[PDB]
Design a protein around this ligand. Structure first.
Ligand SMILES: *C(=O)[C@@H]1CCCN1C(=O)[C@@H]1CCCN1C(=O)OCc1ccccc1
Length: 710
């Protein structure tokens, strides 16, 4: 199998740090500098062995060809109205980036409004955020290059798609909100910093501020509206109330679903937006989340988790703000999570719930909160929606494991609300009726029942002979719901595989309690839950250890890397994408400081004690038993991944190759592929997406010796 030799990698044996009395050696600390000749040489040498390994077996070509054929289907976003026009995103099939279209009426001819594809040869410049002025006549849009979180905001006049001179730099993790007078827009920007700000730097991002840009002026003239100099990690995002009277500021610190909520009655400004606004600190702590839904005068409707982990809707009257006075409009459900809420047609509320990891959609009355209509959906997820307060209709997109998705439309002006299919596309080549999706609940180590979806060809024998692909994330209140994936379906159909997704703790599937069950001191619950999912698939006969592959990205990369260290005997292959591997230093780079709410921080003695036990980089160790080696492992990262700096994967693979790779019993490959002109993943062009999945499945195919099934 292995016809390559791992590259020489210098070990700085003097790199020792004391963590509250615990000495930790970091021999590859030098890989933290992306710009050094040493790090660049390291990346080149790794890619040098990884690429030929992935490209050698013709199965990569077969997969790539089938992926290009099957992924080539029309992809539409929900239509949405702004002013007197309708807009929608659309990709004919294989365009690198989806294009934004505009039409003057639902029946009118559409025309290209904004095509990101012409901004680069390889589709590496992508739209990242946008906002139309209240009247829909002006448009602001963010552009990111090479996958970086950094954004440059540009502007256009909608009538005639005219490019305007306005350009905003140093924008990142930014809100985009126009004042209803159409004069300008609020946005966030970071102070100037030494070195690069292109996605290849590792510099921590602090002191984000809120600015107001007046259309037709230079950015140097922008008004500073809010800043938190004594709290470097605070981030304040603005949004205008539906009536345009109030600017609502949501201040966050970390990744927990909580925020301070301050407001500014624009009518009360002495002379417009001229400097720091007269903020009224309605909710001035980080004890709960308050997500604006709508307001009627001074009565504000918010979605909250304040003493309601499954979320609920409350009305806070700015004129009688005390908590004891808040009205509960839609009480918290016993088990179902209220995911999001939208106000449409003035007095209707669209509520989307997650019931056992499946979405439900319903219409409620704004005044009473009473249920009015249930919008029927098959088992799956609602991944798109449109319908603001002044709109008289809604569009929503549904997807599932076996269906590319349906876009529905409902005219809310009709006495009898009847949702209708507005757009639907089927993928020729994947007959959804040949497969079935089942949801089971398995007990974890502590007995907690964890949901898991399994997708497989109908009528298979549970004899343990099938290759399996198990996916998990487990963290940040993120719910892993059903979604359509051509790449995974090719694994099922053409590689005879079984797909599994485990809804492990740390996610938001069962509200904030589920989230808390997989963070801080309890992070190990995530790893235990996932390992138990693998054991369930094995015990029930869906697969066997040597045929099992586990995959996860970012926090999911951490998930699979830890599982490889803790239970190498349980998996045959592990693909960790853009994963956090150095749990002792993650907080030091870019936006990593925000993740301490889920993981803790090594600066704390108590936290260090939890972290050191599972940190991937610090737990690589040769399996005790002679008959056990590490599973085949592939780490995937990119040079502009400024979300999770690539040094995580670089130090981790150096460690894996040295400690485990050098052992005689280790025959399974331990590799890394670092892509160029790409980042964490958002905005990645179709061409790159195709290459990435082709790499993943070719790796699985080679390592597990799986034959292609025509
Ligand atoms: C991938 O899971 C990485 C590593 C662990 C957390 N994470 C993220 O990307 C998190 C979770 C999804 C969003 N995110 C993030 O850092 O967003 C940036 C941010 C914006 C605003 C406030 C705080 C953070």
């Amino acid at each position: 199998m292995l016809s390559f030799q791992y590259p020489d990698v210098y070990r700085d044996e003097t790199a020792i740090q004391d963590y509250h009395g615990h000495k930790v050696c970091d021999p590859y600390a030098w890989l933290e500098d992306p710009d050094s000749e040493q790090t660049k040489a390291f990346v080149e040498a790794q890619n040098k062995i990884t690429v030929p390994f992935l490209e050698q077996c013709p199965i990569r070509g077969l997969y790539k060809e089938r992926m290009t054929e099957l992924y080539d289907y029309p992809k539409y976003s929900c239509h949405f109205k702004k002013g007197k026009r309708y807009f929608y995103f659309y990709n004919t099939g294989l365009q690198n980036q989806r294009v934004l279209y505009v039409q003057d009426s639902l029946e009118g001819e559409a025309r290209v409004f904004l095509d990101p594809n012409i901004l680069s040869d390889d589709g590496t410049v992508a739209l990242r955020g946008y906002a139309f002025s209240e009247d829909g006549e002006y448009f602001a849009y963010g552009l990111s290059a090479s996958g970086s979180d950094w954004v440059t905001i540009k502007f256009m006049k909608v009538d005639g798609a005219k490019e305007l001179p306005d350009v905003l730099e140093r924008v990142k993790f930014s809100c985009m909100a126009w004042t209803h007078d159409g004069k300008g827009m609020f946005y966030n920007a970071y102070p100037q910093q030494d070195g690069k700000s292109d996605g290849t730097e590792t510099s921590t991002n602090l002191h984000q501020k809120l600015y107001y840009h007046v259309l037709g002026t230079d950015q140097s003239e922008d008004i500073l509206c809010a800043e938190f100099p004594d709290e470097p990690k605070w981030m304040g995002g603005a949004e205008l109330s539906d009536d345009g009277r109030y600017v609502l500021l949501s201040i966050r610190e970390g990744c927990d679903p909580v925020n301070r909520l301050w407001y500014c009655d624009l009518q009360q400004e002495s002379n417009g937006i001229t400097g720091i606004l007269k903020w009224v600190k309605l909710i001035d702590n980080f004890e709960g989340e308050y997500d604006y839904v709508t307001n009627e005068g001074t009565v504000f409707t918010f979605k909250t988790n304040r003493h309601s982990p499954n979320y609920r809707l409350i009305n806070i009257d700015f004129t009688d703000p005390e908590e004891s006075k808040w009205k509960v409009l839609v009480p918290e459900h016993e088990k179902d999570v209220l995911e999001w809420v939208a106000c449409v047609r003035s007095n209707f509320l669209v509520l989307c719930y997650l019931h056992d990891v499946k979405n439900t959609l319903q219409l409620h009355d704004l005044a009473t909160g009473a249920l009015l209509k249930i919008f029927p959906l098959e088992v799956g997820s609602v991944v798109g929606y449109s319908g603001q307060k002044k709109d008289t209709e809604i569009f929503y997109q549904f997807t599932s494991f076996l269906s590319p998705g349906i876009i529905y439309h409902c005219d809310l002006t009709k006495e009898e609300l009847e949702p209708r299919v507005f757009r639907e596309v089927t993928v020729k080549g994947i007959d959804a009726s040949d497969y079935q999706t089942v949801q089971i609940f398995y007990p974890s180590k502590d007995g907690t029942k964890i949901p898991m979806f399994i997708v497989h060809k109908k009528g298979i024998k549970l004899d343990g002979s099938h290759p399996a692909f198990l996916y998990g994330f487990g963290g940040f209140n993120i719910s892993i719901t059903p979604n359509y994936s051509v790449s995974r379906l090719i694994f099922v159909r053409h590689m005879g595989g079984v797909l599994a997704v485990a809804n492990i703790r740390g996610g938001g599937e069962y509200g904030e309690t589920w989230h808390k069950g997989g963070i801080l001191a309890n992070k190990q619950n995530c790893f235990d839950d996932f390992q138990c999912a693998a054991e369930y698939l094995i015990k029930e006969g869906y697969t066997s250890p040597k045929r099992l592959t586990i995959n996860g990205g970012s926090n999911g990369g951490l998930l699979v890397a830890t599982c490889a260290n803790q239970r190498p005997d349980l998996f045959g292959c592990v693909i960790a994408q853009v994963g956090v591997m150095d749990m002792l230093k993650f907080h030091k780079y870019t936006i990593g400081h925000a993740w301490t709410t889920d993981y803790g921080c090594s600066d704390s003695k108590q936290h260090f004690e939890w972290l050191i036990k599972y940190s991937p980089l610090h737990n690589v160790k040769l399996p005790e038993a002679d008959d056990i080696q590490y599973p085949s492992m592939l780490l995937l990262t990119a040079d502009h991944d400024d979300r999770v700096v690539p040094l995580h994967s670089l130090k981790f693979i150096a460690t894996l190759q040295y400690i485990v790779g050098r052992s005689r019993k280790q025959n399974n490959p331990l590799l890394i592929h670092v892509d160029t002109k790409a980042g964490h993943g958002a905005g990645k062009p179709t061409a790159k997406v195709i290459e990435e999945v082709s790499d993943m499945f070719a790796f699985i195919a080679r390592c597990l010796n799986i034959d292609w099934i025509p």
